[PDB]
Design an enzyme around this catalytic site. Structure first.
Site, PDB file in Angstrom:
ATOM      1  N   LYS A 197      24.865 -29.105 -39.204  1.00  0.00           N
ATOM      2  CA  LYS A 197      24.805 -27.768 -39.845  1.00  0.00           C
ATOM      3  C   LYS A 197      26.204 -27.448 -40.338  1.00  0.00           C
ATOM      4  O   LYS A 197      27.091 -27.327 -39.496  1.00  0.00           O
ATOM      5  CB  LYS A 197      24.229 -26.741 -38.863  1.00  0.00           C
TER       6      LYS A 197
HETATM    7  C1  LIG Z   1      23.922 -20.547 -37.817  1.00  0.00           C
HETATM    8  C2  LIG Z   1      23.610 -19.996 -39.195  1.00  0.00           C
HETATM    9  O1  LIG Z   1      23.717 -18.521 -39.332  1.00  0.00           O
HETATM   10  P1  LIG Z   1      24.441 -17.985 -40.705  1.00  0.00           P
HETATM   11  O2  LIG Z   1      23.617 -18.460 -41.914  1.00  0.00           O
HETATM   12  O3  LIG Z   1      25.846 -18.503 -40.813  1.00  0.00           O
HETATM   13  O4  LIG Z   1      24.472 -16.477 -40.595  1.00  0.00           O
HETATM   14  C3  LIG Z   1      24.055 -19.533 -36.715  1.00  0.00           C
HETATM   15  O5  LIG Z   1      23.839 -20.116 -35.500  1.00  0.00           O
END
Ligand SMILES: */C(=C/OP(=O)(O)O)CO
Ligand SMILES: *[C@@H](COP(=O)(O)O)[C@@H](O)[C@H](O)[C@H](O)CS(=O)(=O)O
Ligand SMILES: *[C@@H](COP(=O)(O)O)[C@@H](O)[C@H](O)[C@H](O)CS(=O)(=O)O
Ligand SMILES: */C(=C/OP(=O)(O)O)CO
Lengths: 292, 290, 291, 290
Positions: C193
């Site tokens: 991510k």
């Molecule tokens: C990961 C994504 O949240 P955001 O899109 O950065 O607000 C949070 O755990």
């Protein structure tokens, strides 16, 4: 001032027609008997099946076609028709003869167009039986009276010419008759033309397309195909080909629900067997409208 | 000269209509969003036609102005076949430092020609002031209704309240009611109205204000989005329709936020279109309760 | 052990369309900033998170929940749509230097067997990356996290986030994102991510070049997060990231930040946030279909 | 050499799996639908590859045979990326005038080679007869489990009941139960079973029969479609899953009706795909109730 309904009121948001017919009368009673139902088949068996079909399938349809004989008032009273689905009311009076339930058809003089409009109807529908050796002017006069009944009450007019062999003779070319009915009725002032599929939807796609283009050239109003005479498995291709030729969709009954008559668990069968067929047809209509 | 309200509705009977007819007000929006000034006419035309092209598939009707985009949208096949055309028939007169200080009927609009080319309706903004003659507004609306109906077009009126020419007694909420008392039974086919309280605050207050307004409008009515935050406009449509409204005719709450962004067409598809789609879904959900 | 697979948290297409509502003290600061009564009670966060899960999880392939404010409540209240997988945060945020998340360690309070028994399919770990902090400490934490997940049949999702150095003013955010991916992009996690290059701003061609550069350093599937990207630019960011090789998004702010402080939270999540999440899911399927 | 059942499931945890591995049985189906005999191998290959190409996007896994279509499906990238591959590992031996009179493990299968191509599972049909040695069936299943597990593949077993070699004492419903008593805890990953009562009759009696079966299977289980009318198969999946099944691994109820129609690819998209899609929806609906 009269705010008439428009063809958009019975189409998907795309403008394609994805319409369900459950208005079959003595023909449906004969289908229940043929599937093994206890005879005589009671009126309530037809009403219950029609209302269940409307309840379960109308969420997938842009319009549903209901008859006053067995199900219009019941469907309205029971809120069976999804709010996304327009109501079409049959205005044909079927006359049996020669061992079949629909040997002649006249305009149903009993129908109160203002009353069915108040219940939410947007359109009426009239079957017109076409025979080469019967007077064209009698058919045209009936369609004119029907158009006036609809239009004077702000309703759409849907005509359904269906070809039959001549009263006398054995000179019958079904494919030429469909064309000849369209030459006669294809510019008759109705809002929508419901037509039989050339060649029963059988054979090579290229030949179905040629036949459907020939038909398109004689219809000067939007047109949709009906499923009577087309195997349920060939009807999706028929819709694709008819729309490539200029049609705008379908108004189908048997190709959606005939196969569940006589099965156990009717409501489950309409959801699991009939609904996926109607859903696919709707998807094909949107795919073809997107190509215009 | 036949016409029907059903030519501008969804199949549900609700109105889910897009406005892109903003004129000098749109030029001021581009300047405020940081566009190079002076902002050329072609910038407004290109934005309007892109908005029609990308958003009209989700609308039951789209409202276009002749100054910047009607002819271009028609010629470029920007209007989806499923979306009716509404042509503005208002002539905006600037004054007192604002672009729209007075409004008259636009004598340049050829109603027969827009009918011929497929339009279903005309639209007229009517400025409402407590200290200006009501009969002059009614006479303009009567002339407009005749222009529309004699040519087979629907008439859409849009009364917009303004402070009095003289005085400081201005209650916007009372003026919206007073304009509807005056014009709500004027023979038009559709009333496009400002949302009470800018759509702000408690639903109970918005519903009371919308029910009050409903009682004065004797034609179908829709809400406009000017002055309503884009995030509050879906609730405003829900409340107005609960009170008796039949939908929306909106511009800013659909497309204002993409002015100034890169990749205008992607932004109209990804940012503006989902907003318009949701409003359409709300309209059908509320019509289904009737 | 029948371990979950990445398909268990994707749409049927195989794209990731995942919702984050696990923000902790950062979410409390968002409520304060939006004009809520201060101090903001824990229940304001719990209620918003559970409402967000209830109303938005029907549109998501997975939802990311924290134990601090909402995991147990969402499970007990059946807030997560049956179509939406559960991801549990396993990061322990340490405040410092006036911010809520100055350091992050693995949360030793997470009982992986217990969250698996509740139906969780994946855990998630934020890793703060700084050029002047030891790479081996970050890698060792990621390895311990991967073992916690994999030994329990759960997926591992890592979220490297770049920060300015502890000492110095040499901070190139775009080079840091690349350097973090060089370090952690082949670390044995199931999903990466990552922050969007260039905050999703500017010309599409430059965003694509930057996203392709990043793709080359990640040897696992990757998704983009929305922190730092305007909600109106996030749809284009997903399209461009996926064109570069990403497989979708795991986003919070670009879906629900705008409704914080509005009246009628449930109506706003349905009418304002849901259409944004629906559109992102549609873009993910459109980009997966081009593969 | 890790393996996981989740490699062949929908995200719900249900199984919505497509079988196109039918061999001489498929050739007989083409002849029955009016193909001239002898029906060429290429007819079967072309149909199988088309079915995988058009239907695998709707399936969690697809089952392919090496005789007619595995290599072709791989070479032509016919299997959707979202759909796992299962390879048949059964060697069907004809006898007594039928194509499948005995079944042994297919010794030609290279488990490492099909794994390298992307396969996640192998499948073995086991014919069950009351008067044949249970230990020989168990030994075949154990050898198969070891072939699968030692190479990081799942094991799918498919016990199919047959009348005894000698005698006329055959109760198909009791045989299905007896096969499950024998093989339902045999160490395979998935049990593919015949539907009780051919899916016919009153739902309550189908449920009772399916619950009886469930009690004897100590692994996930799925129903096959042979013997069930395609119109009754959706109810059979619902009832089997109510009893404890986890979905289906089906061929005939999905694609049998398009054999012999013109335009095979269109027919698989318009006739077969909606049936498989509906079955997938039912699987997710039933898993959501757990
Ligand atoms: C990961 C994504 O949240 P955001 O899109 O950065 O607000 C949070 O755990
Ligand atoms: C109607 C609705 O648009 P909104 O942007 O208010 O939703 C429009 O036709 C108005 O007449 C224009 O907004 C007027 S103006 O150009 O802003 O002066
Ligand atoms: C399993 C399921 O297919 P159905 O068509 O029964 O639903 C298949 O793998 C079977 O093994 C074949 O049906 C065997 S056969 O070739 O028919 O002999
Ligand atoms: C019109 C069409 O029904 P079907 O498709 O022929 O069964 C019935 O009025």
């Amino acid at each position: 001032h009269m705010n008439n309904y428009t063809i958009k009121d019975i189409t998907r948001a795309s403008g394609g027609f994805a319409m369900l017919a459950v208005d079959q009368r003595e023909a449906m009673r004969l289908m229940f008997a043929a599937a093994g139902a206890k005879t005589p088949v009671a009126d309530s068996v037809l009403t219950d099946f029609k209302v269940n079909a409307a309840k379960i399938l109308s969420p997938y349809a842009s319009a549903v076609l209901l008859d006053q004989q067995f199900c219009y008032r019941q469907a309205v009273e029971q809120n069976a028709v999804a709010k996304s689905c327009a109501m079409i009311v049959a205005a044909d009076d079927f006359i049996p003869g020669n061992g079949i339930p629909v040997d002649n058809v006249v305009l149903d003089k009993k129908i109160n167009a203002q009353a069915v409009k108040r219940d939410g109807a947007k359109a009426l529908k009239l079957l017109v039986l076409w025979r080469s050796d019967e007077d064209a002017q009698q058919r045209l006069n009936m369609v004119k009276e029907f158009n006036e009944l609809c239009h004077s009450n702000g309703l759409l007019s849907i005509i359904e010419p269906v070809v039959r062999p001549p009263r006398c003779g054995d000179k019958f070319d079904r494919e030429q008759a469909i064309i000849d009915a369209a030459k006669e009725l294809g510019d008759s002032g109705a809002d929508l033309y419901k037509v039989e599929m050339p060649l029963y939807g059988k054979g090579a796609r290229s030949d179905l397309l040629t036949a459907s283009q020939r038909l398109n050239g004689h219809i000067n109003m939007p047109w949709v195909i009906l499923s009577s005479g087309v195997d349920e498995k060939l009807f999706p291709r028929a819709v694709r080909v008819a729309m490539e030729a200029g049609a705008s969709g379908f108004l189908a009954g048997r190709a959606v629900w005939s196969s569940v008559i006589g099965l156990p668990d009717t409501e489950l069968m309409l959801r699991d067997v009939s609904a996926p067929k109607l859903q696919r047809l709707g998807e094909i209509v949107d795919e073809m409208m997107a190509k215009r």
